[PDB]
């Protein structure tokens, strides 16, 4: 829990049971519910040594899971893209994940579901029937990519020059993955040059995405986000739906660096922190330099959707 | 842990594993402890897993001797430096621990992996770089063969991948050994679809790159060439080019076109995982007369001699 | 002997019935160069024009059918936009270009024609010029008989497509395909590969292995009643624009998108489009049949409607004053 | 009026002392087009030549200094090799090309000159021609006064380099930089960026973010006595070849290699080279000084030796018969 300093983001008023060994954090590994200190996987799992895996991360707020159906549908689609047959159904995954959160007692949480090729085979296996895929889960306190004061005041963005986003013809960014070699290089560049977060470009020098977040660009009342070298984010989807509710045209598109610098407003979005403003790029102010009014309406409406009763929410049974 | 090979130049050791030893035939070193394979586990909160923020190397032991251990650990530490990772052990400390690990398994023929990660005490968004706490993990297992023995003798059928290309140096550098195999796995899958044995990937410029776990070498008019850019600087590759120079051939790193691959006199593959083997066809097209060439055969034999003949390439394991 | 008409064997494509005046030295073909209307044999440019030796130029090609120019306004707007993208200031206005081009066609007496308008950086300057004010851009035009990228029997029966493997479309970060240009090094390589492998036309892929375009044409892919065409590594074609408008009028969702090779092979229908020939079907890819290997019904209705739009009085048509 | 000599301010570069005959209509500049020797104002080509509208062509540019052609054999060999790479069969032999080119220079009376030889696919066919035998390739030549990519004072004092960020060199998988070509879309963008950011010349990177080349020149990087130049995304320059030979003669290791931006910034010395100006220093990159910001000693000895090779009797020189 925290006091946020923002009227639209609150936190539950509760205390964790110290008699419960899973309280405040836990994992599900090979059929067992375990505490964080016992949450370990085999070094012989291909999910480690060939990163042969995909995943998704959903969140729980005030005791409700946000867009669980969308999340598990994306996970299973991503698994299909890499020819991975999950050993559980979508319904089974949902039930186990919700149970895991319940055992932690966490009302505000992050829940990761990972599917790997497993430890019963190697990448050179001739017989595809010999592969034995694994599912791993973890539930932890909600994590913030940017702090609360920066959600209010905005963040300073940098366009990376020493690295570009991996092409779809090598390792597809539309498949959520742990292969962050390029994304880590971008973070390191950000430390060197003295900025807060990086945005990468693609092979054609068009806007891609950042480490753990999508970017959105607002110009003359039109709301645009990168369609190609970017994860199809659930937060992004929500942002574009909100934009349409407010009477704006909202579309996926190819966006140039010139268009980024010349934008009315710019924002970032992710399951890990929700929505926040980007007020400058490479030290150049975006319209002056303070969070724009369309961005502010979007941020407020997003957090309303986390609490107002709808089909977007699934109650956790504690 | 042993085989009859059917080849005069590859011979396993004649011995038996002690069944009273719980580490016999396989073991790992994890967070200061020597453990059996079933207890060899790492934290899911290690960044080496969830951001693949790690590098590694794999060396081998043959007839009780580690092969080119110094070169291997030098490459590992160089790769760590390339990704700004400060190892928590020295090169000497790593060598001593790795050799002890093998000794405890009693394996005379083995594969030994040394991995360095960013660790589990921090996250990718950490503001203070001093807060990172890197980890070292090791494992020792029986020697593994990327191709079987009959195929080392008779040759392998290669495929040039069309649905995927090797990750560029401007995204994830192939010259840093890494676990980020998304492209390499796609290539293996394409090989199953099209009915071939192993794949070779191309780079962004449609020049020869490398394969999943191996380098490629191309021989034409007595000149021996291997890809210099989109390829790991292999220790086996290095040995192959040294052997070629010994035999009086010009041996160089270079940019190689697909046309040059199809028109080659000889083609071979190399890796710590299996040594050296011939590639006798590409996309169903024969390389020369479709049988292993004579320069390839001399290289294969000489490689295995170097694994047994007493030299500075060898380091004895104290069993 | 200039060929300027044909019997097509198709009820929806009909040439005009007329004769060229042999007393006219510009009849059947002509050019506009440095203020002068000239015959083809005198249609020459300076080797010192940067439009040649650095290919520092852009262009467009429109057509005339049964005495009417098709979508002239859209064509000249795209040309001027393409010029702006490469920082080239045209020495004529859009209106002036339209007037000169229409006159040129009139002088040829051609009722069915292809008209190319080219803008170059010129011959008064070099690429290393320090003072940008010293550049003196040039406009060149030519008008010729209508040309067909594919023959009439293939418009009816369909064409055999090949996906290129030895070459890829130049990236937007080097030479932008969204700017019409003469820099065809990649496209010519693709054509040569089609001769090697024994196919009729090539389709190139982009850096991400997504569908791009072909030499002188855009590609369109139809699946479960949805009509899609490549948005990135492709010229914003005027024929493409017309095809998508027609699809919407038939009640289909019609969009620009990123399209995979798997999707191409698994398509219900595939077609090609260009000013140079209109619209035609692609019935196989790499020797694999698309559906049952015959032109699909959505494609057929698009082809027929396209040619109807070339004759039915609309704002898409501009009459030539012969 | 025609400028054909200068006082250079440099002891190692000296023009010839002579006067052009004003009775000669080809004096000071001329071209060879379709079998005819013509003056610059009549030097024109057909707009229907594919060398224009599909840039389906390759070329080379050699120079003449103090009445001798420099490395003519190497130049014509590269030209014929480049033609072969794009499946273009030249309509003249290498000997015929040499003889015609030398005659052309002789007719201009120029002792210091630039000579361009171009081979195109021609005007007797189109890119869609089914029968390869129907292609009729053309050769075009021009001879002009020697041209300087950088002025004399900058050869002495050095040039300010910029690494381009808005554009990258066309990949070998689209349009090959190892085939000399007129397809300069990326190179022109780089020049434009140089005007925007306030620098003198640009250097482009390749797809892997490694050093490529510049517009009309190769780059060379010197570090701890080792001399290196980009091997992949770069023309195999004749000037580059000469520079590396000179480096070996001075006792330096001289090699083609993959070079990173970090290595460029950290270099002891950096230089540029081309037929169009010879050799010159690069003293800063993106406003950052290379070493102490003045031309390095290895660079200076290379520059001087290059110009010695242009005058000292050797097999590198072919005399023009005036
Ligand atoms: C390393 C691949 C291996 O080390 C390995 C080990 C066991 C097996 Br069954 C398969 C592969 C590798 C190389 C080889 O370089 P070196 O000879 O080990 O120094 C080459 N290229 C890639 C991409 C690799 O991963
Ligand atoms: C334009 C190509 C042509 O206009 C053309 C003209 C005549 C012939 Br015989 C062949 C080609 C082009 C397009 C499509 O242009 P639009 O649909 O007519 O506006 C698409 N892609 C490329 C690369 C082109 O050059
Ligand atoms: C060749 C460029 C030239 O030939 C040239 C001639 C005159 C002028 Br003012 C400018 C340029 C070129 C090279 C260098 O090749 P070489 O050393 O002359 O054999 C390198 N890279 C490119 C892209 C070129 O065009
Ligand atoms: C995944 C982002 C996360 O799941 C995540 C988890 C914890 C933290 Br502290 C930060 C981020 C991801 C996204 C997110 O899109 P979505 O809105 O969660 O669907 C976007 N882009 C990339 C590359 C990601 O990895």
XYZ file of C-alpha atoms in Angstrom, chain D residues 59-181:
123
model
C 29.574 3.773 -64.578
C 33.083 4.815 -63.589
C 34.990 8.140 -63.417
C 38.735 8.288 -63.977
C 41.042 11.322 -64.050
C 43.903 12.783 -66.118
C 46.737 14.757 -64.450
C 49.577 16.570 -66.300
C 48.611 14.759 -69.534
C 48.470 11.233 -68.035
C 45.444 9.055 -67.222
C 45.652 7.525 -63.701
C 44.998 3.771 -63.286
C 42.901 3.475 -66.484
C 43.162 -0.306 -66.577
C 41.815 -0.746 -63.020
C 38.928 1.655 -63.812
C 37.718 -0.050 -66.991
C 38.121 -3.495 -65.323
C 35.832 -2.360 -62.463
C 33.330 -0.913 -64.974
C 33.090 -4.212 -66.910
C 32.815 -6.182 -63.652
C 30.003 -3.877 -62.427
C 28.202 -4.344 -65.820
C 28.458 -8.122 -65.438
C 26.976 -7.907 -61.904
C 23.768 -6.366 -63.393
C 23.731 -8.743 -66.448
C 24.570 -5.956 -68.891
C 26.672 -6.947 -71.929
C 28.716 -3.917 -73.114
C 28.563 -3.230 -76.901
C 32.305 -2.314 -76.902
C 35.412 -4.185 -75.696
C 37.660 -2.845 -72.886
C 40.336 -1.871 -75.506
C 37.749 -0.039 -77.647
C 36.499 1.888 -74.561
C 40.075 2.905 -73.610
C 40.886 4.135 -77.136
C 37.668 6.180 -77.508
C 38.019 7.709 -74.000
C 41.633 8.768 -74.573
C 40.696 10.275 -78.002
C 37.886 12.233 -76.309
C 40.331 13.778 -73.768
C 42.784 14.617 -76.582
C 40.064 16.564 -78.482
C 39.318 18.711 -75.355
C 43.055 19.578 -75.044
C 42.624 19.266 -71.230
C 45.801 18.228 -69.326
C 43.857 18.050 -66.038
C 40.495 16.313 -66.478
C 37.627 14.078 -65.303
C 36.367 11.411 -67.634
C 33.104 9.539 -67.080
C 32.213 6.308 -68.890
C 28.595 5.145 -68.552
C 26.925 1.904 -69.760
C 23.053 1.724 -69.917
C 20.454 -0.950 -70.894
C 19.447 1.433 -73.746
C 16.347 2.838 -75.536
C 15.449 -0.087 -77.857
C 13.527 -2.027 -75.176
C 11.617 -1.755 -71.839
C 12.053 -3.421 -68.379
C 9.208 -5.880 -69.162
C 10.836 -7.233 -72.371
C 10.397 -11.025 -72.499
C 13.190 -11.669 -74.973
C 16.604 -10.719 -73.426
C 18.159 -10.651 -76.994
C 16.040 -7.548 -77.840
C 18.019 -5.294 -75.371
C 20.411 -2.832 -77.150
C 22.912 -1.372 -74.594
C 24.496 2.070 -75.003
C 27.815 3.672 -74.033
C 28.068 7.415 -73.205
C 31.220 9.374 -72.271
C 32.100 12.897 -71.102
C 35.332 14.764 -70.437
C 35.448 17.911 -68.268
C 37.850 19.971 -66.166
C 39.084 18.256 -62.949
C 36.632 18.761 -60.086
C 37.300 19.134 -56.352
C 34.881 17.734 -53.799
C 36.747 19.808 -51.165
C 38.766 23.030 -51.776
C 42.588 23.290 -51.499
C 42.686 25.062 -48.121
C 40.582 22.187 -46.664
C 43.000 19.522 -48.047
C 45.640 21.330 -45.937
C 43.570 22.214 -42.815
C 40.945 19.420 -42.738
C 37.162 18.899 -43.024
C 34.293 18.680 -40.458
C 32.456 15.347 -40.691
C 28.868 14.430 -39.640
C 27.403 10.957 -38.971
C 23.930 10.865 -40.543
C 20.946 9.963 -38.289
C 17.889 10.414 -40.593
C 19.057 7.989 -43.317
C 21.168 4.828 -43.804
C 23.096 3.437 -46.813
C 21.015 1.244 -49.104
C 21.540 -2.472 -48.227
C 23.377 -4.939 -50.534
C 20.059 -6.914 -50.554
C 18.291 -4.058 -52.435
C 20.735 -1.834 -54.450
C 24.396 -2.907 -54.099
C 26.868 -0.093 -53.178
C 29.704 -2.247 -54.573
C 28.215 -1.560 -58.052
C 28.885 2.114 -58.900
C 25.468 3.604 -59.641
